[PDB]
Design a binder for these strands. Structure first.
Ligand SMILES: [Zn+2]
Length: 75
RNA sequence: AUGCCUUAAACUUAUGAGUAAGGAAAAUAACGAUUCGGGGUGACGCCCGAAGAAUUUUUGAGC
């Protein structure tokens, strides 16, 4: 398996996929807007009640939503 | 972070069937009908019912 690679570890590949999705989506979120918690979750720092969201995919989908946009323009 | 060849590949980016139970967002429905009685609740929530002409000035007691 050294000379030509054999097989693939689909669980670790899925871990890598989660990292690459995270890096991609994170580069479009400015550093003030998102606060990363101790366990790897994310809070929205715009919205006054700080909702906490499990992934960066959910944080991006939240930042699309109308509650966030209304809370955004006040800040 | 170097140019070219058939975007170099006429290669693939897979992840079964169910049981029971939670968390978070998106989306979406409403705002003031006042008091009284009853249901409910630790308490509110909530729910069910009922209802500008009259003594100090400008619409005259004046003739
Ligand atoms: Zn937000």
């Amino acid at each position: 398996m050294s000379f030509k690679r054999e097989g693939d570890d689909w669980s670790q590949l899925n871990v890598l996929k989660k990292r690459r999705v995270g890096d991609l989506l994170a580069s479009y979120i400015p550093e003030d807007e998102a606060l990363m918690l101790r366990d790897g979750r994310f809070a929205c720092a715009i919205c006054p009640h700080r909702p906490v969201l499990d992934t960066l995919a959910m944080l991006t989908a939240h930042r699309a939503g109308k509650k966030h946009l209304s809370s955004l323009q006040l800040f």
